[PDB]
Every structure is written in C-alpha cells, then in structure tokens.
Amino acid sequence: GFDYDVVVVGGGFAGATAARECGLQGYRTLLLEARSRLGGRTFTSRFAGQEIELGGTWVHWLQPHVWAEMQRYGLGVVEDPLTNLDKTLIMYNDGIVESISPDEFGKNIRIAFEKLCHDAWEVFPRPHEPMFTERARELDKSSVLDRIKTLGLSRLQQAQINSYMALYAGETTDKFGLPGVLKLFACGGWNYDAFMDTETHYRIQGGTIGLINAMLTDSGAEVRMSVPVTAVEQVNGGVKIKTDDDEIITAGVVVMTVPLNTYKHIDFTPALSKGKQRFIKEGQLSKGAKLYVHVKQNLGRVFAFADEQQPLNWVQTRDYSDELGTILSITIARKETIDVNDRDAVTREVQKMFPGVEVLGTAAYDWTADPFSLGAWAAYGVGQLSRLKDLQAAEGRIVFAGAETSNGWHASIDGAVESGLRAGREVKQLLS
Amino acid sequence: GFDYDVVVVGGGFAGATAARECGLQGYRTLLLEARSRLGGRTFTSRFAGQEIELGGTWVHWLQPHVWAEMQRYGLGVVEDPLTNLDKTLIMYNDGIVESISPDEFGKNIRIAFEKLCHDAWEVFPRPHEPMFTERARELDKSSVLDRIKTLGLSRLQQAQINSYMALYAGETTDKFGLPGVLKLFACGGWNYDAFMDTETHYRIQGGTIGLINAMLTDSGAEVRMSVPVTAVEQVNGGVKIKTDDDEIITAGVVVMTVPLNTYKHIDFTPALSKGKQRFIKEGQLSKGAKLYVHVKQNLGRVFAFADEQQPLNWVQTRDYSDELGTILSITIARKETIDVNDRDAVTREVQKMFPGVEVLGTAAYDWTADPFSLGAWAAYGVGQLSRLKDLQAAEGRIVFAGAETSNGWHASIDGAVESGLRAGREVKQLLS
Ligand SMILES: Cc1cc2c(cc1C)N(C[C@H](O)[C@H](O)[C@H](O)COP(=O)(O)OP(=O)(O)OC[C@H]1O[C@@H](n3cnc4c(N)ncnc43)[C@H](O)[C@@H]1O)c1[nH]c(=O)[nH]c(=O)c1N2
Numbered sequence: 052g053f054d055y056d057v058v059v060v061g062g063g064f065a066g067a068t069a070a071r072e073c074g075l076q077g078y079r080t081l082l083l084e085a086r087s088r089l090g091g092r093t094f095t096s097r098f099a100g101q102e103i104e105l106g107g108t109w110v111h112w113l114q115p116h117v118w119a120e121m122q123r124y125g126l127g128v129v130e131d132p133l134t135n136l137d138k139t140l141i142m143y144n145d146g147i148v149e150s151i152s153p154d155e156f157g158k159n160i161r162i163a164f165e166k167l168c169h170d171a172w173e174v175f176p177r178p179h180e181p182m183f184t185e186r187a188r189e190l191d192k193s194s195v196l197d198r199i200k201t202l203g204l205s206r207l208q209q210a211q212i213n214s215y216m217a218l219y220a221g222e223t224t225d226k227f228g229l230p231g232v233l234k235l236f237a238c239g240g241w242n243y244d245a246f247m248d249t250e251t252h253y254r255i256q257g258g259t260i261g262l263i264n265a266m267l268t269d270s271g272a273e274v275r276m277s278v279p280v281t282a283v284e285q286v287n288g289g290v291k292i293k294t295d296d297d298e299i300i301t302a303g304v305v306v307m308t309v310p311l312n313t314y315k316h317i318d319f320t321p322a323l324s325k326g327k328q329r330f331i332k333e334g335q336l337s338k339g340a341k342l343y344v345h346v347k348q349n350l351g352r353v354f355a356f357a358d359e360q361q362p363l364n365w366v367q368t369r370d371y372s373d374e375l376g377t378i379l380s381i382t383i384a385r386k387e388t389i390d391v392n393d394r395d396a397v398t399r400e401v402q403k404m405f406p407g408v409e410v411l412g413t414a415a416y417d418w419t420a421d422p423f424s425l426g427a428w429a430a431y432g433v434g435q436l437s438r439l440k441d442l443q444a445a446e447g448r449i450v451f452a453g454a455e456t457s458n459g460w461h462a463s464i465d466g467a468v469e470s471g472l473r474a475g476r477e478v479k480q481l482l483s
Numbered sequence: 484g485f486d487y488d489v490v491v492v493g494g495g496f497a498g499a500t501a502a503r504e505c506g507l508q509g510y511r512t513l514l515l516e517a518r519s520r521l522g523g524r525t526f527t528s529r530f531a532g533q534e535i536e537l538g539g540t541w542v543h544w545l546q547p548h549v550w551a552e553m554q555r556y557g558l559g560v561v562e563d564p565l566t567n568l569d570k571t572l573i574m575y576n577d578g579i580v581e582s583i584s585p586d587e588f589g590k591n592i593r594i595a596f597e598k599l600c601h602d603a604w605e606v607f608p609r610p611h612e613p614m615f616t617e618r619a620r621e622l623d624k625s626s627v628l629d630r631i632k633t634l635g636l637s638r639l640q641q642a643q644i645n646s647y648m649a650l651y652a653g654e655t656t657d658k659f660g661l662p663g664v665l666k667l668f669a670c671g672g673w674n675y676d677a678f679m680d681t682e683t684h685y686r687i688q689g690g691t692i693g694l695i696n697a698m699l700t701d702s703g704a705e706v707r708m709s710v711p712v713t714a715v716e717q718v719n720g721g722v723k724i725k726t727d728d729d730e731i732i733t734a735g736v737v738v739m740t741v742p743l744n745t746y747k748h749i750d751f752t753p754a755l756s757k758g759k760q761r762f763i764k765e766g767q768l769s770k771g772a773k774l775y776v777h778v779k780q781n782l783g784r785v786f787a788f789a790d791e792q793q794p795l796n797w798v799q800t801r802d803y804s805d806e807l808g809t810i811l812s813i814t815i816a817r818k819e820t821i822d823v824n825d826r827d828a829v830t831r832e833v834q835k836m837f838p839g840v841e842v843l844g845t846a847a848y849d850w851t852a853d854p855f856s857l858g859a860w861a862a863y864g865v866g867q868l869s870r871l872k873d874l875q876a877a878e879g880r881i882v883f884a885g886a887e888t889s890n891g892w893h894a895s896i897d898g899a900v901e902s903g904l905r906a907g908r909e910v911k912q913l914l915s
C-alpha cells in the first residue's frame with residue numbers, strides 16, 4: 052500500500068519512455084523532474100525566428116527505438132542541409148582554417164573512419180551485446196588515440212578524425228575509450244556512410260519536446276517539475292523517496308534515469324553495489340556544450356571540423372538565406388576551450404573560423420555547468436564499457452536506466468529510449 | 484453504441500501489433516482470425532525434436548519496429564549457423580551443383596549485389612519514403628532482370644544473384660519490380676554485408692509465436708479464431724462486419740490486415756477505391772513455400788543457392804551433429820517447381836543437391852495453396868511500388884495494414900509490425 056506503484060526519477064527520454072510503459076500497464080505512476088522543464092539533455096527552444104535544439108537533436112531510422120516511437124506517434128523527419136555542401140572547413144590545432152573541396156573532404160573523413168573502425172565486424176558482430184566477443188574486452192584497454200596513432204593517416208585525415216573523436220568524447224581523445232566508438236559504428240550498419248547519416252542529418256518533426264510530451268500524455272502519469280530527489284531508501288518491501296525539501300513519497304519500485312554524473316546529489320540506503328559506486332566515482336567523460344550563432348552573411352550549406360585544441364569542433368548550417376543570413380549550429384567538445392555564455396569570446400572564435408562575418412546573436416547551453424546534467428552525451432573512458440553491466444543491474448526494488456546504461460546507441464536519444472523500454476519491462480517483472 | 488470500438492481482422496504480426504496498440508489505449512477491441520491458429524505467415528512448429536519456423540523466421544536489430552518489440556518484451560536473438568560455413572553450393576538452372584570455396588562464394592555474391600544496388604544511396608536516400616526521389620519512380624518501369632542484364636556479371640555471380648532475386652520475388656525475376664529491392668538494400672544500411680546479415684542469421688528467442696502471444700496478452704483484446712470475415716459494410720457512422728456464418732459484429736473502426744492476395748474473400752460496401760481495386764486484382768507476386776528436411780548425415784554448416792528453374796532455391800543449416808544428422812531449412816521461390824507435400828519428389832530434389840544423403844523426414848508448408856495467405860512474403864511486380872499509397876490509404880472508417888502496406892521492410896515481420904503501429908495511430912485519430 053504505497054503512494055504509487057512506481058516513481059520515475061527524471062523527465063528526459065529515458066524517464067518519459069519508462070513512465071509511458073508503466074502507465075499503459077495501469078500502474079499508478081509518478082514522474083519527478085528536478086528542472087522546471089522536461090526533456091533533460093534535450094531542450095527545444097527558439098532563436099532568431101527558428102525552433103532550435105540546444106541538446107540532443109538528430110535521429111535516424113537505423114536507430115530502432117526512437118524510430119519505432121516516431122512511427123507510433125506519426126512524427127516525420129526534418130532534413131538539415133548536410134548534402135550538396137558549399138563549404139567544408141578544417142581548423143587545425145594550430146589555428147589554421149583550410150577550405151577543402153567538399154568531395155575530397157568527405158572522401159578523407161570516410162577513409163579515416165573506415166581505417167579507425169576496420170575490425171568493427173569482427174569485434175562487434177552483435178553491437179547490442181557489447182561484450183559478446185573477447186576481442187571487445189581486450190580492446191577496452193585501449194583509447195581511441197592509441198588506435199589513431201597506428202593508422203598512419205594523412206594530416207588532413209588525422210585532424211578530421213581527431214576532431215570527430217574529441218566531439219564524441221567531449222574530451223581529448225587520449226581519454227576516450229575505443230570499443231564504445233567501434234560499437235556505435237557497428238550500430239550504424241558497419242559502414243561509414245550509413246553511420247555518418249545517423250548523426251547530424253535528420254531532426255524530429257515537431258521537436259524532441261513534442262515526442263517527450265506525446266509519451267507523457269499517453270502515459271497518464273502524474274508529472275511534477277522542480278522536484279529534485281535527494282535520497283532513496285529501500286524499506287518495508289518498497290522504497291521511500293525523499294526530495295530536497297524533505298517530503299517523502301513511497302512506492303513499490305523506483306526507476307532512476309538521472310545522468311550518471313549527477314548521482315552525487317542522491318543518497319542511497321542501503322548503499323549501492325561496489326561496481327555502481329565505482330561508476331559513480333568515475334562518471335562519464337563528456338564536458339561539451341552547444342551554441343547557435345546568427346550571422347548576417349549567407350554562408351550557405353557549411354560543415355566544419357575543429358581539432359581538439361580549438362573550441363568550435365563541429366559546425367553545421369541550421370538555416371540560410373539572403374534575407375535571414377545564416378544560423379550556425381556548433382557543438383563544443385570541451386567547455387574549458389570556450390565560455391559559450393561569453394558573447395565576446397564567441398564572436399572572436401566564430402570570426403577566427405569565418406573571418407569577415409558580423410555576429411547578430413547567440414543562444415548557448417552549457418550542459419557541463421548545469422547541475423542536472425554535469426556533462427553532455429554519454430562518453431565512456433578507458434575500461435568502462437567492460438563494466439557496463441554493473442551500471443545496468445537492478446538493486447532490489449530500484450531500476451536503473453538512462454542512455455549511459457543502454458547497450459546500443461548510448462550517445463543518443465535512441466539509447467535513452469532503449470533504456471526506458473528495458474526499465475518498463477523490469478518494473479513489470481518486479482510488480483508480478 | 485457499437486459492439487466494439489475497433490475490430491482487427493487478422494492475427495499475424497500486423498494485427499497483433501494493432502490490437503496491442505488499441506487495447507493499451509483502453510479501446511474495446513476484438514481480433515478476428517480466420518485460421519484456427521495465430522501467427523499468419525509465421526508458424527512456429529516442431530520437427531525432429533526441434534522448434535522450427537515454417538514461415539517468417541529471421542529478424543535483426545537494424546529492423547527498427549520488430550527490434551523495439553523485442554526490447555519491450557525481453558526477447559534475445561538465437562543465432563543460426565551462417566558463419567564459418569563448411570559448404571557453399573550453387574545449383575545452376577541446368578541442374579549442375581558446384582561446390583565453391585566459401586570465401587569466394589561470399590565475395591561473388593557481394594560483388595553481384597553491390598553492382599545490382601549501386602545507386603541505392605541516390606535512389607533511396609530515405610527508404611521509408613519509397614517515392615521520395617524522381618529516380619525511384621522512373622526505375623519502377625524496370626524489372627530486376629532488366630538491371631541484371633546490364634551488369635555483365637560472371638556466370639557464378641549471375642546465377643547467385645538471380646537465385647537470390649527469384650527467392651525474394653517468389654517468381655521469375657523478369658516479373659520482379661526493381662525499386663522494391665533497391666529499397667530493401669537501403670533499409671539494410673546501404674551495404675551488402677549489413678543487408679545480408681538481416682535476412683537469415685538471427686531468430687527470435689522463444690519464437691515468432693512467443694512474440695505474437697506477448698503482444699496479444701498485453702493487449703487485453705478479445706481474440707476469436709476460425710472466424711473468417713467475408714463482408715464489411717460502412718453504415719450508421721461505423722462498420723458492420725459479417726463472418727462466413729452470417730453473424731454480424733458492429734464497430735466504430737475496422738483494421739484490415741489480411742494478405743493482399745486474399746482480399747477476394749471479402750465484399751466491401753461501399754466498394755473500395757479504384758486504386759485499391761487495381762492492387763487487389765493484381766495481387767502480389769510471391770508463390771513460395773517452405774520445407775525442412777532431416778537427413779541422417781552430418782553435413783555441417785551449409786548454404787546453397789539454386790537458380791530459378793530449380794526448386795531448392797535457398798538452403799541453410801538449421802541444426803547439425805553426428806548424433807542427430809542434419810536439419811536443412813529450404814525456401815522455395817515457386818511452388819510450381821516442386822510439390823513440397825510430395826515426399827518422393829522432395830527426396831529426389833534434395834539428393835540432386837546433396838547426392839548420397841538418406842532422407843529421414845520432412846516438414847513443409849505450402850503458403851501459396853493456403854487460402855488465408857495465397858502466396859508467401861510480399862513481392863511487388865513492375866510498377867506496383869509507385870502506387871503503394873493507394874493500398875495504404877484509409878477508406879472512411881476502414882484502416883489497412885499488413886506487410887504489403889508498409890514503407891520499409893515490406894518483405895519482413897518488421898514491415899508487418901510497422902503497419903500495425905501505423906494502424907493503431909490511425910485508429911486513435913478516427914476515434915478522437
Ligand atoms: C549538447 C548535446 C547534444 C547531443 C546530445 C546530448 C547533448 C547534451 N545527444 C544525446 C541525448 O541528448 C541523450 O543521450 C539523451 O537525451 C539522454 O536521455 P536520458 O533520459 O538518459 O537523460 P536526461 O539527462 O535527458 O534525463 C535525466 C533527467 O533527470 C533529471 N534529474 C537529474 N537529477 C535529478 C534528481 N536528483 N531528481 C530528479 N530529476 C533529476 C534531469 O533534469 C533530466 O531531466 C544526442 N542524441 C541524439 O540522438 N542526437 C544528437 O544529435 C545528440 N546530440
């Protein structure tokens with residue numbers, strides 16, 4: 052006789068999915084969200100007359116869980132201008148910006164990536180079972196930089212792949228675990244063209260917040276915002292959940308979906324397992340941020356890499372026209388390379404990359420400074436993928452989810468949805 | 484004031500999915516199935532001590548809808564012996580069986596398939612929108628044989644690819660539409676290795692029937708078997724459904740999921756649209772059947788193609804050992820090349836392919852003669868993909884689903900699930 056059958060902590064995609072699964076079973080469901088908004092590491096907002104995505108943005112039909120949701124709710128794709136590019140730039144660590152023929156640019160990043168992931172088929176024949184092969188466990192002793200060193204890439208190819216990999220690590224690539232990258236490549240059909248198409252080409256029709264809201268409406272769950280959970284205690288055959296103002300909610304089962312790097316806000320009684328405590332002490336790697344920039348000039352359809360010692364590591368066109376000018380979408384690997392909330396620094400760096408432009412405005416999100424993410428997309432350090440099961444394991448009546456805990460597209464919205472479907476299955480098992 | 488909110492006609496994957504979607508919304512849901520069993524064009528059975536799948540069998544994590552279901556219900560994959568093959572055979576139209584080095588066999592089918600589908604990226608950048616490009620519509624005037632003629636393949640490669648394509652057509656390849664094949668290739672990550680991995684490598688843990696049952700149990704729907712629908716009439720703002728014994732059930736909405744080739748059993752009032760009537764008169768192409776064969780000898784891990792003038796077009800090992808012998812899984816493109824229910828003919832043909840073996844038993848399913856399939860997997864003839872929307876369109880309070888009506892993996896379980904998710908969404912729209 053608890054207040055609720057299940058309490059879901061966190062209202063990003065993992066928690067919204069889990070609440071939808073539980074609510075459709077008829078369970079009395081409550082979702083507690085710490086921020087005063089839903090979406091978590093996705094955030095739909097508005098800027099220079101456009102809808103923008105300040106966190107997770109792009110999806111793909113090769114991503115099975117989010118795609119099945121878009122099928123269920125009737126959401127199409129919205130194509131960003133990634134094809135027929137006008138300008139493809141590389142900014143080297145030394146600050147030189149070089150314009151490359153788009154054809155040659157794409158050929159060289161494809162060569163670099165296919166070399167980096169040359170053994171993906173043999174190491175990850177089953178990418179949703181990351182430790183299926185012994186070779187995957189053996190490679191979890193290496194970083195991505197360790198492998199890049201052995202490819203003997205050209206200078207352009209080295210700069211491109213190290214930019215790409217620093218972005219995916221949200222860190223320098225000497226800290227970035229290698230098997231996680233090979234696994235993502237395998238999820239994308241074991242080929243560079245398919246994989247790249249999944250990463251920054253198609254957005255969700257109606258936005259990430261539209262899909263979140265659809266699932267939560269569907270769910271019937273009670274949703275409370277601005278309510279951080281600070282303690283969880285297993286007692287009386289269920290759980291007591293304490294919020295920051297010391298109120299207590301009881302439940303038969305709790306689904307945790309908060310980001311790994313935020314677990315320090317929450318006291319567990321009894322303590323979690325040693326393997327989980329080790330993951331919580333380590334956290335996940337990424338220190339990224341995101342920024343949109345409105346410039347007066349029409350730069351057309353552009354793509355730019357910047358290597359890891361520079362701040363504007365992944366640049367794409369979000370919109371362009373003679374009338375509007377250009378909106379640039381810019382993902383920053385390491386918030387320590389640039390204060391995305393310092394407009395003067397941002398204009399300096401944008402002009403470094405595109406000399407001549409005048410900056411009409413910016414919209415930024417510092418995911419690393421936000422207390423309820425404390426980092427960006429999930430990025431595993433060396434040796435962490437090998438221990439993933441420690442983070443996935445249930446502990447009594449507490450179920451764990453979130454993209455960090457997924458097997459497949461762990462750096463994506465899809466991995467969050469996957470973990471939420473798993474969580475709902477586990478709740479059903481616990482309430483049988 | 485109808486008997487039910489929605490009646491789902493058909494208990495294969497499309498109907499079970501649609502009923503699950505409707506039941507979880509709380510709609511009063513009934514499913515009518517014509518056979519005395521569920522599963523439709525999947526059928527889990529038993530043979531020589533093993534569980535076998537006499538219809539749809541293999542699935543993949545690149546197939547988004549069925550994979551999301553497996554995630555929801557906790558179903559793993561079961562690997563059949565497709566790697567590290569002992570024997571790879573090609574049987575030519577002239578009846579010669581030739582054993583090919585497995586490495587060479589695989590390289591040659593890969594070359595043939597990558598040439599056949601060379602423009603898949605450009606024609607099907609968005610495989611779930613099959614008519615997105617003008618080139619796709621233009622190509623829908625050509626058959627697969629038209630393209631094979633222009634590739635100038637070697638004799639081995641031509642025989643391999645024509646066997647593969649006759650199987651997918653369930654017909655000779657001069658009748659097989661080309662764009663549907665390019666689209667399937669695109670769904671599979673635009674590359675042969677990924678694509679081939681999706682088609683006959685992994686089975687559903689617990690069987691197709693286990694997933695069907697999980698969805699229907701979840702649904703809460705009322706399920707009736709051995710009850711064929713023979714007429715549907717839209718009247719009084721809903722629908723009157725008549726069964727073969729002239730009983731009448733009323734509903735707000737009906738979801739049709741029966742195979743295209745069986746629509747001749749059902750009278751619609753008012754008549755369906757001309758575009759639908761044209762599809763129903765044409766039907767879909769496939770005339771296939773399936774057979775398992777138990778032989779005394781241990782043949783190990785085998786794969787064989789037979790070209791379209793021969794009957795045992797796709798052969799794989801389902802199980803092998805010295806103790807038990809071998810179980811061969813055999814898919815037949817055209818039931819007119821062999822009477823799979825004629826054990827003597829079956830033994831003759833198996834021995835033609837593997838001379839010397841003793842045939843201990845068989846289990847077969849003639850999908851083409853069965854009145855509630857009248858064919859096997861969905862296979863489009865020339866010009867049909869272009870008109871797919873005619874088949875997909877709702878007609879008043881009648882919703883249409885089934886694998887033939889899906890946009891993506893139309894020849895698969897996945898396409899059926901996809902269409903059932905679409906149907907649930909459309910029912911929700913109609914009942915608002
Ligand atoms: C800048 C950037 C860019 C990208 C991406 C991320 C980011 C940050 N990703 C990844 C994607 O955004 C991410 O994997 C998912 O949104 C994670 O969803 P979860 O639900 O796991 O965590 P998420 O962090 O969304 O949800 C956790 C929730 O818990 C809440 N919370 C934390 N502590 C709490 C407490 N104590 N009590 C209560 N609530 C608490 C938080 O407020 C948050 O709402 C991405 N993906 C993709 O598919 N495509 C892309 O292009 C990108 N790009």
Ligand SMILES: Cc1cc2c(cc1C)N(C[C@H](O)[C@H](O)[C@H](O)COP(=O)(O)OP(=O)(O)OC[C@H]1O[C@@H](n3cnc4c(N)ncnc43)[C@H](O)[C@@H]1O)c1[nH]c(=O)[nH]c(=O)c1N2
Nearest residue numbers: 493495496497517523524539540541712885886895896899
């Ligand atoms: C031999 C063989 C082999 C394969 C495959 C098929 C076959 C036949 N496929 C394809 C796959 O099996 C298929 O696409 C789906 O099962 C189709 O599901 P649907 O629900 O669309 O039709 P399905 O035909 O399953 O369901 C329709 C239902 O309607 C019923 N019905 C018909 N008329 C009726 C009436 N008047 N009233 C009531 N009910 C009526 C039928 O009895 C049937 O149950 C496959 N796929 C895959 O993913 N992997 C594979 O390996 C294969 N291989």
